[PDB]
Ligand binder design. Structure first.
Ligand SMILES: CCCCCCCCCO[C@@H]1O[C@H](CO)[C@@H](O[C@H]2O[C@H](CO)[C@@H](O)[C@H](O)[C@H]2O)[C@H](O)[C@H]1O
Ligand SMILES: CCCCCCCCCO[C@@H]1O[C@H](CO)[C@@H](O[C@H]2O[C@H](CO)[C@@H](O)[C@H](O)[C@H]2O)[C@H](O)[C@H]1O
Ligand SMILES: CC(=O)N[C@@H]1[C@@H](O)[C@H](O[C@@H]2O[C@H](CO)[C@@H](O)[C@H](O)[C@H]2NC(C)=O)[C@@H](CO)O[C@H]1O
Ligand SMILES: CC(=O)N[C@@H]1[C@@H](O)[C@H](O[C@@H]2O[C@H](CO)[C@@H](O)[C@H](O)[C@H]2NC(C)=O)[C@@H](CO)O[C@H]1O
Ligand SMILES: OC[C@H]1O[C@H](O[C@H]2[C@H](O)[C@@H](O)[C@@H](O)O[C@@H]2CO)[C@H](O)[C@@H](O)[C@@H]1O
Ligand SMILES: OC[C@H]1O[C@H](O[C@H]2[C@H](O)[C@@H](O)[C@@H](O)O[C@@H]2CO)[C@H](O)[C@@H](O)[C@@H]1O
Lengths: 432, 432
């Protein structure tokens, strides 16, 4: 409760920031997709004993290429969708035409990235080049850093222009569709012109693209801080001392760091679906499946410790009613019911348990004892045991990491919850 | 005024057809963009004396390449924009999640169009195959004819599932953003599973792909009817007998034809900026710039007449208050304001003059006497003389077709404009 005149005003200014908000929320537009694409991803890469052939007989030899189609349409397009989302949202926000702001930036994005791919002859400084081609790697996870930048730049200029009433003023008699279209025309024009001119500029620098300067000075070195151990710790430690103030750190931090956590995730995904070594430990589903187990503490453990050791009626019930939302990694019932939010005693293991589960989980995967995330974006709401297996692209070395973490949490919480249960049975006999 | 218990019910009912409406209004999203793209096009193609070289001196002998950037981000991205538009609208309609339905149909377009491009060295069956690319020829005009079939089919199925409550029931304490997503997760997944299959089928045919079967069976034949003289005369008649009932005929015919009218305008553009003879006569701007001159039916001519030969006190002040909007090709004040709309005097020239002007241009352009439309989509609101100039890519045989055309209307209207004015002074004196 006490150190809330230090964390909770800053936490409020961040969660209200319109730009991290616009990005954070707009990014949600991708989620159901990155999932749909993972059902196909992990139906074709599932390492079942008589599976690689099982499917071969029925379909054919290349039973595996079809199952790569949806993955193309979702995973290699993340930033395209994400660009609509973000602009559209920052659109709704500024009370401008959202449909417009969110298509303007679809267009703008494309304008920013070149419609051509160049093949080079190895160390010969000569080349051929395919044109009228949207490089489908500049759409994927490696571009949502420019998806942000340009969606935010476009929509921001776009709203400022309608708000400056710089607009085509169509006669009232003309249909309403007509009025809306021509309204946009002038801002729209000016926006593409700016982005265009921005391009031409980097078109004339060392880095030839927009995506390039942005990836060299931003996307790249930040992906580094991201897969850091300090990167995974400081994120997890922020994610929870936000919940502490009753905010949803998971989506708040998640919303800042996901442009990196799914870039890394994606890399792993590409390697995996080609029999290669999986490079990163820190992905999105790293935390989602090996740290955020019950929900936002290792809560699932705490909930089994109420359903097991809770003498009082107050908890024996809270744990009776919150294995379900817990089993699926949803925990509002606990953080807010126990409560854990703003609760001195319980807040201790609530912050500690995830760092201790991050450090552990982290190393297990480096030491190579425990598999890495395959990169299949399995959703944050996946039952603890099926989650670990499927997150390692079908590697049981991941199930044992969870059973391990589960056990670790179940013991760090236990003594803390005993101390609560006892405080609770006290006032439950109206003790004062 | 009597045969309007024959078409008045036919018209009205098509205007409320939910798919032709989704399409009609979805395409309006691509509009302002081609207007924007075209401003760049018609800059870097201006055949003005002492220009092509003047610019080359200031930026480089390679300047035309940059002004082809905005063009690629608009024109070559029609269908990609128009899938969102149609799917959204058609979703807005069914009162479902539009952002969803729209972002879903965009993902479904890209799923149905393959990320390979195949090149071939004639004769030798020698080839090179590029993976990881979106064929920009397919996001352009050549696609919007499947953009429809994919938005419609994808949205139709989508709302169906959502209405049957085939969704994921998330806990009520869980954030509303979390609730909206999984809500979509099942329908969305089923949706792609469908279209995906609809692909794997044609990837087993003489067609090989979706973009192909659709091109051959639908987009190619309907394209030739559209470029036909009848196709530019049944369509222009349809547009005016439809105003003869008070409905926006252009908007109706348009949003039902334009998937063809603006394929022809793209393939006039493909040629134009590669210095070739522009193939088709009939494009979107064939009508807007040479036929629909004042608005509904060379209305500008009939209006001019009122400013010149204004016997009555009313037609004199109607004219005084409708060349302003007439100049810009809006003519509501006239169609509805002196009631051409259901009146059977003014309706005679209202319907004829267009269908005249159409032939007196479809031949003027086949007889090579007048320049075909460059294919720069210049907006229908562009004033008369400049229109014929820019609409031809700077050729003057366009500024003349107008003059002859606007002259020609003036003398099919003048007799009626007189007859009417006659009536209006009588009933304004107190006579008969
Ligand atoms: C560059 C960005 C510009 C793109 C703009 C495209 C938007 O098109 C939109 O397409 C929609 C129907 O599909 C339009 O629906 C309307 O139809 C009703 C009756 O005509 C009307 O009175 C209502 O205000 C409205 O519900 C909408 O009014 C239009 O605005
Ligand atoms: C197939 C996939 C389709 C998935 C579509 C996902 C889109 O997510 C959507 O993204 C929107 C903001 O951008 C969300 O707007 C919210 O913002 C408010 C706070 O400012 C909040 O408190 C409101 O309850 C809520 O309306 C919306 O609640 C969410 O539902
Ligand atoms: C759609 C969406 O934004 N999903 C994710 C969040 O819901 C999720 O946070 C988790 O949400 C649950 C309900 O709101 C919470 O009970 C749960 O505690 C919470 N997880 C944490 C660590 O706080 C996270 C998952 O990483 O991010 C969003 O993407
Ligand atoms: C955005 C849009 O739908 N534009 C086009 C129409 O505006 C246009 O019709 C023209 O609109 C004006 C206002 O409603 C009218 O005054 C004018 O008479 C009218 N012209 C005709 C022939 O109806 C047409 C242009 O092709 O179709 C729409 O697409
Ligand atoms: O503190 C040593 C620690 O690591 C061991 O070996 C590791 C090594 O330390 C790492 O550098 C890693 O990258 O490679 C080795 C694993 O293959 C042991 O794995 C471990 O038991 C030991 O405690
Ligand atoms: O009625 C004759 C008409 O055509 C003339 O020559 C045309 C010809 O008719 C067409 O077949 C066309 O394809 O080629 C010619 C056009 O260059 C004249 O051009 C024309 O003046 C005349 O009215």
């Amino acid at each position: 409760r006490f150190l809330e005149k230090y964390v909770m005003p800053v936490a409020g200014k961040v969660a209200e920031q319109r730009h991290l908000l616009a990005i954070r929320d707009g990014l949600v537009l991708t989620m159901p997709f990155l999932i749909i694409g993972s059902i196909f991803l992990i139906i074709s890469t599932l390492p079942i004993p008589g599976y690689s052939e099982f499917m071969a007989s029925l379909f054919g030899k290349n039973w595996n290429v079809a199952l790569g189609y949806p993955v193309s349409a979702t995973f290699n397009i993340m930033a395209l969708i994400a660009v609509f989302g973000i602009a559209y949202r920052l659109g709704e926000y500024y009370k401008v035409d959202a449909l417009a702001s969110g298509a303007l930036s679809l267009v703008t994005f494309l304008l920013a990235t070149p419609f051509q791919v160049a093949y080079i002859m190895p160390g010969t400084k000569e080349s051929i080049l395919v044109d009228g081609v949207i490089p489908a790697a500049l759409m994927g996870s490696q571009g949502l850093f420019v998806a942000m930048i340009i969606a935010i730049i476009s929509t921001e200029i776009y709203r400022f222009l309608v708000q400056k009433k710089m607009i085509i003023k169509m006669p009232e008699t003309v249909p309403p569709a007509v009025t809306r279209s021509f309204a946009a025309l002038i801002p729209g024009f000016i926006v593409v012109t700016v982005v265009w001119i921005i391009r031409l500029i980097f078109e004339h620098t060392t880095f030839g693209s927009i995506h390039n300067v942005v990836g060299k000075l931003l996307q790249e070195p930040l992906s580094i801080l991201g897969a850091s151990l300090w990167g995974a710790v400081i994120a997890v430690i922020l994610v929870h001392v936000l919940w502490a103030c009753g905010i949803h750190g998971a989506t708040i931090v998640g919303g800042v760091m996901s442009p990196i956590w799914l870039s890394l995730m994606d890399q792993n995904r590409i390697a995996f679906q080609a029999g290669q070594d999986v490079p990163n430990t820190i992905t999105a589903q790293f935390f989602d499946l090996w740290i955020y187990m019950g929900g936002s503490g290792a809560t699932l453990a705490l909930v089994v410790g109420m359903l097991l050791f809770a003498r009082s009626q107050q908890l024996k019930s809270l744990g009776r009613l919150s294995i379900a939302p817990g089993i699926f990694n949803i925990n509002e019932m606990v953080t807010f019911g126990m409560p854990i939010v703003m609760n001195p005693l319980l807040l201790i293991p609530f912050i500690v348990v995830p760092v201790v589960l991050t450090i552990v989980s982290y190393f297990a995967m480096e030491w190579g004892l425990v598999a890495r995330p395959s990169g299949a974006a399995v959703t944050w709401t996946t039952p603890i045991l099926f989650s670990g297996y499927l997150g390692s692209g079908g590697k049981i070395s991941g199930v044992i990491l969870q059973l391990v973490n589960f056990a670790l949490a179940f013991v760090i919480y236990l003594p803390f919850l005993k101390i609560w249960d006892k405080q609770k049975i006290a006032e439950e006999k109206g003790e004062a």
